Curated annotation (Swiss-Prot), chain B:
Gene of this entry: cagS
Covered residues, full protein: 21 to 181 of 196
Transmembrane segments: none
Name recorded for this polypeptide: CAG pathogenicity island protein 13
Source domain of life: Bacteria
Organism: Helicobacter pylori (strain ATCC 700392 / 26695) (Campylobacter pylori)
Length: 7, 161
């Protein structure tokens, strides 16, 4: 979540 | 958006994995060198920016040094995540974690950027990352990765976003 909130 | 990668990715073989790890390490040292070395930071800005001139006036080394302190930190947390959980960085899809650091490491990316682009990117990073605790795993997360067995489960685990 935290990661894909940045890709 | 990137379900493309999430539709043909396979497992990462031993060497492809290390390839990823060394890349994270190379950036982590680069980042540290920016805020720790003054000559280093100015030297990188002159060779990467399309217009070094305007960058020192519009943005300044002071703001660049900031993100890099925070970039070194994040590269450190990810590196530990990697150590403490073998299967983190299971497939080729995970190569997408790299996209967080490339905009401040790759010469082509930063050369193409503009002043404004860089300024807001720096501002954005400065605001999200501090309060985003990325790569800080929980037992639940660790357990999960500990159990991973096939790209099938993983792909659905992520397909489930």
């Amino acid at each position: 979540x935290x990661x894909x909130x940045m890709x | 958006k990137l379900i493309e990668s999430l539709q043909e990715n396979e497992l990462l073989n031993t060497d492809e994995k290390k390839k990823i790890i060394d890349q994270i390490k190379t950036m982590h040292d680069f980042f540290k060198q920016m805020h720790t070395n003054k000559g280093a930071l100015d030297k990188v800005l002159r060779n990467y920016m399309k217009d070094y001139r305007a960058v020192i006036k519009s943005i300044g080394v002071d703001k660049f040094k900031k993100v890099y302190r925070l970039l070194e930190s994040e590269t450190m947390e990810l590196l530990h995540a990697i150590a403490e959980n073998p299967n983190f960085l299971f497939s080729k899809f995970d190569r997408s974690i790299l996209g967080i650091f490339l905009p401040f490491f790759s010469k082509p990316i930063m050369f193409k950027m503009s002043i404004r682009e860089m300024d807001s990117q720096i501002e954005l990073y400065g605001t999200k990352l501090p309060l985003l605790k990325l790569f800080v795993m929980t037992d639940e997360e660790m357990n999960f990765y500990a159990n991973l067995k096939t790209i099938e489960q993983y792909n659905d685990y992520v397909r489930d976003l």
